């Protein structure tokens, strides 16, 4: 298991534009196109992203290219963020993947707002961090995913991703 396999489990793979859990136009492996309610706006973003006229459909190769770019951008983002970077640097490789997963799902700003959880993670208070992380809109709106990510942060194992 690794970050790519982990996010592939959490995000799925769809080759036509769809709406994510928040109602937003998305394609591939959780690649958010736009928060606009205009399908035409989403299609324009997709064409720009892929570099051709797609008409809302991409190949598996194209979806994986976007995915690679998106994972790379999440990591670079963490490393450029004054609040996230120290947390990331403090963690082992398995828990670092938890952090990338959260950033991939909700963005840097949103994760950086988990101030109290981030402090508990940096202190390596794993059970307490896990309890605090669940007191969140994130957990209530995507509880199965949040439970897997939280278990990863709590155990520093991939146990939550191995029946899948
Ligand atoms: Cl892009
Ligand atoms: Cl995403
Ligand atoms: Cl979920």
Curated annotation (Swiss-Prot):
Pfam families assigned: Phage_lysozyme (PF00959)
Catalytic reactions on record: Hydrolysis of (1->4)-beta-linkages between N-acetylmuramic acid and N-acetyl-D-glucosamine residues in a peptidoglycan and between N-acetyl-D-glucosamine residues in chitodextrins
GO biological process terms held by the UniProt record: cell wall macromolecule catabolic process; defense response to bacterium; peptidoglycan catabolic process; viral release from host cell by cytolysis
Induction, per UniProt: Expressed late in the viral replication.
Cysteines engaged in disulfide bonds, as pairs: none
Coiled-coil region list: none
Domain of life: Viruses
Active site: 11 (proton donor/acceptor), 20 (proton donor/acceptor)
Family: Belongs to the glycosyl hydrolase 24 family.
Effect of residue 26 to E: Complete loss of activity at neutral pH; covalently bound substrate
Function text: Endolysin with lysozyme activity that degrades host peptidoglycans and participates with the holin and spanin proteins in the sequential events which lead to the programmed host cell lysis releasing the mature viral particles. Once the holin has permeabilized the host cell membrane, the endolysin can reach the periplasm and break down the peptidoglycan layer.
Chain segments annotated as transmembrane: none
Phenotypic consequence of residue 117 to F: 10-fold decrease in enzymatic activity
Subcellular location: Host cytoplasm
Effect of residue 20 to A/N/S/T: Complete loss of enzymatic activity
Consequence of substituting residue 26 to H: Facilitates transglycosylation more effectively than hydrolysis; covalently bound substrate
Entry protein name: Endolysin
Effect seen on changing residue 132 to M/F: 2-fold decrease in enzymatic activity
Outcome following mutation: residue 132 to I: 5-fold decrease in enzymatic activity
pH influence on activity: Optimum pH is 7.3.
């Amino acid at each position: 298991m690794n970050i790519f396999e982990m996010l592939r489990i959490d995000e799925g793979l769809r080759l036509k534009i769809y709406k994510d859990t928040e109602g937003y136009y998305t394609i591939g492996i959780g690649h958010l196109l736009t928060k606009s309610p205009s399908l035409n706006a989403a299609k324009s973003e997709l064409d720009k992203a892929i570099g051709r006229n797609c008409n809302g459909v991409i190949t598996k190769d194209e979806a994986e290219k976007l995915f690679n770019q998106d994972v790379d951008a999440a990591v670079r983002g963490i490393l450029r963020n004054a609040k996230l970077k120290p947390v990331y640097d403090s963690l082992d490789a398995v828990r670092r993947c938890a952090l990338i997963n959260m950033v991939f799902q909700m963005g840097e700003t949103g994760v950086a707002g988990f101030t109290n959880s981030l402090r508990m993670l940096q202190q390596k208070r794993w059970d307490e961090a896990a309890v605090n992380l669940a007191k969140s809109r994130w957990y209530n709106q995507t509880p199965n995913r949040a439970k897997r990510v939280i278990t990863t942060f709590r155990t520093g194992t991939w146990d939550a991703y191995k029946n899948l």
